[PDB]
Amino acid sequence: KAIPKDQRATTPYMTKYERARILGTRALQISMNAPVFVDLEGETDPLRIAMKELAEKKIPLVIRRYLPDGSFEDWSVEELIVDL
Amino acid sequence: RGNLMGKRVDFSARTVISGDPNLELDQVGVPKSIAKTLTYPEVVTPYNIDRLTQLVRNGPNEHPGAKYVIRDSGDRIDLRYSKRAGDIQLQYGWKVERHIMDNDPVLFNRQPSLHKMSMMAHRVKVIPYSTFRLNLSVTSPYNADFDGDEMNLHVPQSEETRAELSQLCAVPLQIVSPQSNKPCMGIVQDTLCGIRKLTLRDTFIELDQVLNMLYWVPDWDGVIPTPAIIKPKPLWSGKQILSVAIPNGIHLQRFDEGTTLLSPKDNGMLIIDGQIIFGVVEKKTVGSSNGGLIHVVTREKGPQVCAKLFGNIQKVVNFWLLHNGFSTGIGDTIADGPTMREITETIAEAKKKVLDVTKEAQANLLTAKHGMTLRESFEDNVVRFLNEARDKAGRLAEVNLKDLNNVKQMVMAGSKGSFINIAQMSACVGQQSVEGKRIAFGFVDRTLPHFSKDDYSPESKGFVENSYLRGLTPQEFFFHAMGGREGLIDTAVKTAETGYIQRRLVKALEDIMVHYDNTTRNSLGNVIQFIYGEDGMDAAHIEKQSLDTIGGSDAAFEK
Amino acid sequence: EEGPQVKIREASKDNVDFILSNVDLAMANSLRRVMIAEIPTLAIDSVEVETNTTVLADEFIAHRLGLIPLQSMDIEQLEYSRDCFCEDHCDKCSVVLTLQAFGESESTTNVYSKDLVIVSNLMGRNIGHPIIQDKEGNGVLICKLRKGQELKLTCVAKKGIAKEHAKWGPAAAIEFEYDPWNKLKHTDYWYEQDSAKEWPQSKNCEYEDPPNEGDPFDYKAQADTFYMNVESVGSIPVDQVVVRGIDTLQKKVASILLALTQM
Amino acid sequence: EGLVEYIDAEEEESILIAMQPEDLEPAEADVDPAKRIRVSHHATTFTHCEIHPSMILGVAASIIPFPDHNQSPRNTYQSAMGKQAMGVFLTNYNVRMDTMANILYYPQKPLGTTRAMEYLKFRELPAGQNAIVAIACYSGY
Amino acid sequence: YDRKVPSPTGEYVKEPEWVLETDGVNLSEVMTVPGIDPTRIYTNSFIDIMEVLGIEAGRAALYKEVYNVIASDGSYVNYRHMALLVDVMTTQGGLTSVTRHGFNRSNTGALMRCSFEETVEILFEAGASAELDDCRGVSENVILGQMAPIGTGAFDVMI
Amino acid sequence: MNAPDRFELFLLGEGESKLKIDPDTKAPNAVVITFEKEDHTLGNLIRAELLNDRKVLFAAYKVEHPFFARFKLRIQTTEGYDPKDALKNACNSIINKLGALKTNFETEWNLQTL
Amino acid sequence: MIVPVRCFSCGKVVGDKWESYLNLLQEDELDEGTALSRLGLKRYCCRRMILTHVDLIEKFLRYNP
Amino acid sequence: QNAQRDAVTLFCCLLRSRLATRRVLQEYRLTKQAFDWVLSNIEAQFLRSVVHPGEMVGVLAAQSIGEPATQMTLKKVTSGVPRLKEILNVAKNMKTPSLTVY
Amino acid sequence: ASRHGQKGTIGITYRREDMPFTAEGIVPDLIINPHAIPSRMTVAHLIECLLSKVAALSGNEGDASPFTDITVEGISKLLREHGYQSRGFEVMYNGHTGKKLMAQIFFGPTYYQRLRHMVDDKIHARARGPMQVLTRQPVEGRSRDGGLRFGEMERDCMIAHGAASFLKERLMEASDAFRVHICGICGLMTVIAKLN
Amino acid sequence: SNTLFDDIFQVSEVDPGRYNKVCRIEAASTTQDQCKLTLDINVELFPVAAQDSLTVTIASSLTRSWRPPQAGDRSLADDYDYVMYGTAYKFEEVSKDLIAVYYSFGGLLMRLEGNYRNLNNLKQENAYLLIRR
Amino acid sequence: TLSHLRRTNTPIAKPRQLHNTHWGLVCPAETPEGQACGLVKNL
DNA sequence: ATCTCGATG
RNA sequence: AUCGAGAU
Ligand SMILES: [Zn+2]
Ligand SMILES: [Zn+2]
Ligand SMILES: [Zn+2]
Q: Which of B350, B468, C138, E144 supports an S-S bond with C112, CB 3.0-4.6 Å?
């Protein structure tokens, strides 16, 4: 189907699962010399870069949350709130 | 079942385990040979190369090196043979299977795996010797003990998979469990027998010990706190320095039976901002309890704070105790001469109780309790009589054991043992039972061939009068034998009957999961629960509070 | 003299029961530790085996010879094998012995340490003699032979220390007790009725005062006076054991102090 | 000479066995309070008396020092593990070539013994050593 | 039995009461009697509860009994868990065993029921009926070695 | 097998210096000295004589783990005094006591018979 | 299997006292406890070493070649 | 929005009970600033406590009973393991039937 | 370990000095924890230890023969006649520091067993290696550099946590992983890699 | 920089509650018949017994690392023998017309009860306690 | 070796139970754990 | 009812 | 591959 930018209910907060793999999939790209959109106050490890790429919401991914019928809702990692 | 849903797999290990207290909770002592063998594929990058090449150089036999290197073409460079193995200029966009190192994420499990908790991500710390070492206070979830228990360890291969381990699976995340909405990790054995005796009012610690203890705590702020006592000789209380291990913004209030903001039993617990004010610290406070110091510190300060907490509590109490010491003799099961006299006769009065009911019953006077045989109401009367006899002999003993009796000292900590354990050691052991009832007549109308037939007395039907101290008699022994055969049997029959339960329970629920609409449904989209747990709330984030709208006077609701 | 103070009482070829007065417990301990584990000694750290027809296995026998007590009086003018510039041994850092015995008789032929045979040029220094305190003259029972069995060996003693392996203990057993009556209250005695009919009274209560019951706790009291007894094995006579310990202890304090000098 | 009889389970049904012969049939006529509490003589009938009771026990358990002052399933545990105890399994180990065989260096007869250790040749062919043991919290390792 | 109940004045207090405990079951006829309270009367036969008072009462015994199993040992387990279990058992309309009869004939894709007690048969009558497996189930995405609709794999990742 | 050779207890490896000194960041006028290939025999005797001196605020040691032959001494001292000395003075204080003793024993040894 | 040179726990030589010990029991007709004390074994760890060490060697020698 | 009102219900009954006027001011003497903190705090603290979509409760609820199930071992009732066995079998053939009438 | 079903693994080895010592100079060969004594009621263990002390001392055989008029008392009385306290305690000194231990300690010869099951016979570790012919899974058993089974049950645990990708990785890139071709119509392993 | 409370008490009971190094004391004040005290005390360091007369002060000084001595040459409010330092934790209206404070000296607790102690026993961390002669 | 000569095996109401009449003939303690507990006995 | 070992056609 | 013996 689709769904609009509106009419979204789907927790605006981030699941730990969401975060997990966003971190994970970023950590990956970093670990394969793909560019870093932060400044490294002095870190090497791919994950702990991704962690800092995230907390200054400079990560350019979009979650696609499926609903059980067959629809879904899109969510940039700018919108989602990292509490936890 | 065997090859698709449960394979055998690469990059795994297994060893004996043993407990190590100078090792943080979320850590795993990996022995060195294993880390010399297992490997994670790292990808060359500006960030790493310098370290990274030094590995390749080192070679696959001095610890922090590596085996194989893999290139554009995917060709495998074998660092252990190969002419070119002291060479190799690392070219960005390659990989380098490397020795597992300090601070890597790994899945450390014990079988049987009947939890999430039986599988957790740990933090590697490579060490000599050949034992997966671990922290005492990660015992319960795994269900381990160090009498030869063996444990598997799995190693992630993907950057994402590493994340999955450190972010979802990690030991400090699992502390506060959803299962029983309480913490699953506590403070056990030496640590705990000590978290307490350190604590007594009576326990005083003078300057020289204090200073090592303070230091012993890693987080220590480097500020000798002012001693309670300054007068004659400036002393510190047990409590006092243990307070250091406790972080700040930590508040805890207990109250047990005789407790009063004066606590003349040094009862309960009062703690205001990482400071212990009165009360002995024992299992109720610092076990895997619900009101628990650990339930608090976790939710309040964070998972990683409570994780280091454990270490610090340990390190100080483990030290102090090491210099104070503790033991256990057979003297700790002996008890006062006149008490053994009182205990004996306390049994004796119950042996006439039963005698009398036997003699009563023999004259058809015994009346039947509505809906059971005279014989079942004879048996019932008797069994009770000697259960109440054991207990009372026991309680009689629970009293001689003085506040220094090492058995009792562990008992008061909640570290090991129970009343029953005292009862049977010092007092009488008690009645033996098979299939619920006292000892059968396997022979004709008699228990053994040392008895006359038709003998329903205690002795004859499996009452062990002596203690594990004095020692059992031939008969007692043999009945006692029958006792814990039945025991051993259904033990290893409980373990199968159950291993099947946990398989079907699992296989039916399995695919259920809260979807992104906070409903709760299976593979077909068929709804089960419209909100998870009926409030859409994770169990871990939940605790026993009181609803003081419910109870008390209409007056004092209004007062 | 000045601080730390001795009063020998009993004295033997292997026993030195003394009172050690005016010291920190700290050092009474650190002396005892060193005395066990840190004064150097000669013992056999390389057996080179020609023929062994014995009941016992090679590396078993090897073990035992290692544990054989050897003279170590002039040890401190022998070098560690690691420190000498030679390839493997020399006579400058090792002392080699040989064992030959062969079942000859019918009636069980014994092999004592007494049959160990110096070979290497001693340089005329007191070193690497199988120590014998046996009365009938034969040290340790190495192993037993039958009618037709051989032992043909080559021992190579090296300098070493307990820390490395306990064959280099010169030490055996150190007695050590302070404050006979619990005047300082460094223990809390475990009791059934009377704390004092139940624990006994060490000979060491004789050379100290009772407490005149009424008196309160001596609160700012510390420990002087430590009743010791160093039992030597034989490698070194007893005097030297306490001595070289005091020495070696001093010597590794030195190295730190002098290691700030270097830094 | 008829001083002894071979009794089976079935015939055991029709008899009365005495446990001790001593304290169980002299004339009836103080009690060191730490001794255990054996029952009485309440029987006059006895046809044949038990040789000695520690013969209800089998090979393994007869190795245990004081199994009477011991919870019953413990004894059972030990009686599986004495069969995993390292020691001299035979004098002639030196001449027998079997897949795997362990022997202890300095085998040591125990200090605490059972009267049925004599017939079980356990002091002659020990397994295990006589260690000075200390019950204490020390390093907490 | 012992009961905690309101006093007129507000306090909860001990009104001790008189209950009868049976050995045998015919709910059908004992609640219809005089002098009992038909609003309370309880059987440990949650199976007899259901056929009488409908599914939604049945559930709430099934639970209550599962609870008394765990609780009588001291152990506490947070509701939701046992609730879910009970909820799953009781939603097809009937009571549905946690054995191959209840939960393994239940419509599911085939590969799932495969990974359990009657393997081959289920593959056969899947074959003949021409079942279409969804590939939404845990067990099935494990067989084919793919990312499971689970925590990490429930969502999708994009740009 | 994973056992390390014993000598690693009292023999220094490569680029491993008996003392490594760093400045404790938490306190002031304070110091943490690592002692490679040494154990309680040394650390405990150093601490005690570090505490008798009356211009010392604090001192303590700890063998971070009993597999390894290391140990960490932490000293804090008076406004003025630099711990290196407080350590120096200490070490010597000790050496004398021992020299005193070594003599004093040797004296009372010689007077006895047998 | 031959006396164990030096007692495990304590460290004092004892391998040199075996033949001597057997001679004190069998010959001057003494109880092991006195014999043990006579041979300078006063602690009990050092004592238990002689009072136990069982001399299996006397049985393997028994075999021929 | 009616499920919402009904998932929150019990929490508020608490919230209001531990937030009554008398109590806020008299029992635990709060101040505007601290009170408005306590207010903002709970909200966050609640929100965090929600279930995260992805949670595989299916398994989790099984394990959480299946575990303490393996930890049971030893006034006439079928109880422990054998009862559990009964229960989950949906026993028609059951051993301790009992009516309990008030 | 011991003789009354009280087993144990070694956790650590200390050198004689670091061991706590008795004033007579003795040190313990082996230290057990007092926390495995209340809950298995292994009283004999204790009694053996007391008996065995006396007997080592007096140089007499320990009679622990089962049914007997031997008594904890009957022994203790003798242990005293010899100079040590009658319940096997001795005052000990933490050898680290020298200082007396605050508690007194149960100390005695106790017959211990060495058991089979040593570590360096168990310490298998695999990091990829040989695979079976049929399945192309890693082989059973350390005896041929085999794998470790990531069983059905350990799967359940990775599902619980929510770790999907790790599940894949464990169940694919380690162990079996294999690419096949498939018809985009008659959906079957019927195809034909004339790959090249 | 000053004192907070002062009085001479007399002890009635001396209670060792399964303890050999502390006794908790119930003592009463000469002077004002609306006042009494409760005090957990190290009775090995500074003994105490039947119908005794003890003096008491609170104070708030003579907070960084505790230096010691160098103070055989210094200020010390130590004209007193026994002396502790605690945190204070509750101020109990006995109701009235009367008020009780609660101090903790590392688990050695303290109760007090009067009514001028108002503008005089603050609400505070500071609380030394000095007990002479 | 002695024990394993003096062993008993039983294939397959309630036979694992130590039974009264075992007194004297079969050992009440000696038996393996789980698997085949109480089916296997020693004399 | 996760592991090690031996044996066997 | 069949098979028994063990660690939990
Ligand atoms: Zn040389
Ligand atoms: Zn010895
Ligand atoms: Zn096709």
A: C138
Partner residues linked to E156 by β-bridges: A64
> Which residues are close to ligand 1, an ion, with C-beta < 5 A?
C 84, 86, 90, 92-93
Q: Say yes or no: Cβ of I152 under 7 A from any atom of strand L.
A: yes
In this complex, which chains have at least 3 CB pairs below 8 Å with chain H? A, B, E, I
Please name every residue paired with C227 in a beta bridge, in sequence order, or none if there are none: C19, C177
Neighbours of E74 (CB within 10 A): 9
What resolution in angstroms does the PDB record give? Answer: 4.1
Backbone angles phi, psi at H22, to 5 degrees: -40, -50
Pair type for strands C41-47 and C150-160 = antiparallel
- Per CATH, the homologous superfamily of domain I131-196 is RNA polymerase alpha subunit dimerisation domain (3.90.1800.10)
Q: Rounded distance, CA A10 to CA B518, Å?
A: 8
Element holding F83 (H helix, E strand): helix F83-110
- Alpha-carbon distances, residue C10 vs A64, C15, F114 (angstroms): 89, 7, 9
I20 and G CB contact within 8 Å = no
Nucleotides of chain L in contact with protein CB (under 7 A) are 1-7
Exposure of J34 in the CB half-sphere (CA atoms within 13 A): 11
Class of residue B455 by CB neighbours under 10 A (exposed 0-12, middle 13-18, buried 19+): middle
Give the span between the Cα atoms of J121 and D113, in whole angstroms: 71
Helix and strand counts by DSSP (H, E) for chain I:
4, 7
Angstrom distance (rounded) from CA B89 to CA B91: 6
A28 touches chain E (CB under 8 A): no
The correct answer on CATH 3.30.1360.10 for the domain covering F1-114 is yes
Contact of F76 with chain J, judged by CB distance below 8 Å, is answered with yes
Domain ranges of chain J: 1-133
- The CATH number of G1-65 is which of 3.40.50.720, 1.10.274.10, 3.10.180.10, 1.10.10.60? 1.10.10.60
3-class SS of residue I182: coil
Give domain J1-133's CATH architecture: Beta Barrel (2.40)
- How was it solved? X-ray
Please report how the helices B406-413 and B419-426 are oriented relative to each other, as an axis angle in degrees rounded to 10.
160
Distance CA F75, CA F61 (A): 9
* Angular region, B371: left φ>0, alpha ψ -120 to 50, beta rest: left
Could you tell me the sign of the dihedral formed by the alpha carbons of B356, B360, B363, B368, in that order?
Answer: negative
Using the structure block, give the residue that is written with the tokens 């969401």: A18
Q: Using an 8 Å CB-CB cutoff, list chain J residues near B231.
A: 45-46, 78, 80-84
Return all residues near I186 (Cβ < 8 A) that are at least 6 apart: none
K8 — phi, psi (to 5°)? -135, 145
Q: Which residue of B has its CA nearest to E77?
A: B180
Q: Which domains does chain C have, with CATH numbers?
A: 2-40+167-263 (3.30.1360.10), 41-166 (2.170.120.12)
What sign has the CA pseudo-torsion I11, I15, I18, I19? positive
Q: For CA atoms D112, D117, D118, D124, give the dihedral sign.
A: negative
Which residue in the set D114, D128, D134 is minimally distant from I107, CB to CB? D134
Q: Where are the beta strands (DSSP E) in B400-553?
A: 430-431, 463-464, 520-521, 527-529
Task: Judge if B213 and B153 occupy the same domain.
Answer: no
Report the distance separating Cα A11 and Cα H52, nearest Å.
Answer: 9
B401/F11 Cα distance (integer angstroms): 51
Residue type, B399: V
Same domain, B337 and B406: yes
Cα gap D117→G54, rounded to integer Å: 15
Is G53 touching C (CB cutoff 8 A)? no
CB contact under 8 A, E152 and A22: no
Closest residue by Cα to residue B10 from I128, I125, I155: I128
Q: Which H helix or E strand runs over F42? A: helix F40-50
